[PDB]
């Protein structure tokens, strides 16, 4: 009865998905400068580009790397480092993009970039979120279905995993009681890691002095200001004491580590009209952050006056789970979620006068809609070394490395 | 054409 109408709603929407994908596949030469669709072995709940890029001399490509996880209900889940062949910006545009190999004069053109798996490390349950520490990018922290946050060093592990299945983390970080998804490393303090969880708490560890030899580290500070499930937490990128957290009590809370009150934050906004799932600070604007939520909106915030919302970005059709600023342009925001769309926003076009044809397509700050995933996008990541290149993963084992066309943004 | 297609990726225009 309850699963009868749920399977009725999933079967009507699957024909809407299959009709939307083939229209998107026809529109792919006019929308993108790169499409790399790779079917993964297992679905990934996390995606983040490693910041190192190796560029071989004489070749038109470079090797970029990704931090991936697996989302299996069987007991062989893996922390996965993959490697992507991305073309350089001094390389010639041809038919090597769009996963194509048909030449433009009746034959073969060029090959596309390939995605292989380098390192697999055994993991206690599925990887909810995996993030590298920026001061040492060999250190990757993960989130488990249990209460433990695990810290991995992939140079101290073999590339092929054990068939025994024993997960051996380099550190075991405890302090939570339930699972969670939020994770943030401090870029101005080494080893300061934040984590959000379902036990209404934010934990903070300092692992900068303990050796990475399998010991158990307890939490330095536990922040108990939220009253519901804490979805995401993020450090500020310039000031080392400030961090932000969003939760299921519709609240954005800005904290300070110099405060002694660990149950009351520095500021607190009634941020949305539903559960707030993600936040991201601007890397170029020190007062600006963005929060995304289950009321199909992205909210723009100013830290100097948090009681007034700056802007509401409205084009999504379902619950928004990840928001990320672009690390090359300060006005470029991206967001994804349950509506199988990754929207790219441009806040410099806020307030521009449109035609009524263009008003039906959306607001003028909406720049691009990625319509390539056929399931719910769990996580995405901007490439920090190649501009406008986004990896994005979804629940149907689909990872898409893509870049939009140049005349959309450059005018 | 390219900027209007960016905001309507499910438009078939055919
Ligand atoms: C010019 C153009 C562009 C797109 C994306 C689609 C069509 C049909 C025409």
Author numbering:
A (entry chain A): 1 to 411
B (entry chain P): 2 to 15
The authors write:
RbAp48 (Retinoblastoma‐binding protein 48, also known as RBBP4 or NURF55) is a WD40 repeat containing histone binding protein which is found as a component of a variety of histone modifying complexes including Hat1, NuRD, PRC2, and CAF‐1. In order to develop tool compounds for the study of RbAp48 function, we have developed peptide inhibitors targeting the protein–protein interaction interface between RbAp48 and the scaffold protein MTA1.
Structure based optimization allowed the stepwise increase in potency of the peptides by first optimizing the chemical properties of the cyclization linker followed by converting the monocyclic peptide to a bicyclic variant. Furthermore, the arginine is conserved in both the R1 and R2 binding sites. Mutation of Lys 678, Arg 679 and Pro 684 led to a 6–20 fold decrease in activity while other mutations had minor effects on binding affinity (compare entries 38, 39, 42 to 33). The bicyclic peptide 33 was significantly more stable with a half‐life of 94.3 minutes. In conclusion, following the goal to develop tool compounds that may enable further studies of the biological programs modulated by RbAp48, we have developed potent bicyclic peptide inhibitors via a structure‐based approach.
